């Protein structure tokens, strides 16, 4: 995250770190959506241009974390993957369209002050909240600038940007399964996701029921925090049908 701040303890208790077993390192962000399902970006697991293609036994999920590097004894919980599900129409060849994947855990995780799931939007919360100018929040342990690493989880609030501005900021083909967020050069403020923040959540707090909803997944950006550029997020509600099919079939 660049130009963000240290998270508060328990601020993002749905935050998940995807961790490589060997060499031991941060792979991506992710989010907890039930006691045994974790949501992330497909590109976190499968991205052939970079020779990335992870299997279940290659990874772990670390839940409840705050510090990036430390093992947070008595707080974090570390989980093995039962199975990975990638969207069957994920477009890694061109523009990361449908950049979403589910991970089912070997055993349920115990909720705690630091571990709790986020909500996924229904059609009405999505229609109400996904409006240009409305702000969401992105969290992660990824780079602090385009090119240090943070000591702890970073947080940044960013406004949703109008679709024509998103489209005009890039030569990549944008789809209805994405939205973009960030400040414009004239808005003063800045901030963005960056490398390592992939797969983490873009969340919003509904003013109707005061619950946090995950509206987006950190997906792609040209550089990080560049003027006139925006971060792009997977539109979770648009892929809701797929998410429910998976959970309803593989439970």
């Amino acid at each position: 995250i660049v130009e963000g701040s240290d998270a508060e303890i328990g601020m993002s208790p749905w935050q998940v770190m995807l961790f490589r077993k060997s060499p031991q390192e941060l792979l991506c962000g992710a989010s907890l959506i039930s006691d045994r399902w974790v949501l992330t970006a497909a590109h976190c697991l499968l991205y052939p241009p970079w020779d990335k293609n992870f299997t279940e036994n290659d990874l772990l999920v670390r839940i409840g974390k705050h510090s990036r590097t430390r093992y947070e004894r008595n707080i974090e919980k570390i989980s093995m993957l039962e199975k990975i599900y990638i969207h069957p129409r994920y477009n890694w060849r061109e523009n990361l369209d449908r950049d979403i994947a589910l991970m089912k855990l070997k055993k349920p995780v115990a909720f705690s002050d630091y571990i709790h799931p986020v909500c996924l939007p229904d059609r009405e919360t999505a229609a109400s909240l996904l409006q240009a100018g409305y702000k969401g929040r992105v969290t992660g342990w990824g780079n602090l600038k385009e090119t240090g690493q943070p000591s702890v989880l970073q947080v940044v609030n960013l406004p949703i940007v109008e679709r024509p501005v998103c489209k005009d900021s890039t030569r990549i083909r944008i789809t209805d399964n994405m939205f973009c967020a960030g400040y414009k050069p004239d808005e003063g403020k800045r901030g963005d996701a960056c490398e390592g923040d992939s797969g983490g959540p873009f969340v919003m707090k509904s003013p109707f029921n005061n619950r946090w909803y995950q509206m987006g997944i950190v997906s792609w950006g040209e550089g990080c925090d560049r003027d006139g550029k925006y971060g792009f997020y997977t539109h979770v509600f648009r892929l809701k049908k797929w998410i429910q099919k998976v959970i309803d079939q593989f439970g």
């Binding site: 701040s5 508060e8 303890i9 328990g10 601020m11 208790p13 959506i33 039930s34 006691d35 705690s112 002050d113 630091y114 709790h116 799931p117 986020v118 909500c119 996924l120 909240l129 100018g133 409305y134 702000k135 969401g136 929040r137 947080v155 609030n157 406004p159 919003m204 707090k205 509904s206 003013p207 005061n210 619950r211 946090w212 909803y213």
Partner: peptide
């Protein structure tokens, strides 16, 4: 869950975090 999106150290205790009001204010 029935309790999704309600954080134990914040909503469940009626405590707000330091920047959630920036989100609320953007929601017209």
């Amino acid at each position: 869950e029935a309790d999704c999106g309600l954080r134990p150290l914040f909503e469940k205790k009626s405590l707000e975090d330091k920047t959630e009001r920036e989100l609320l204010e953007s929601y017209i």
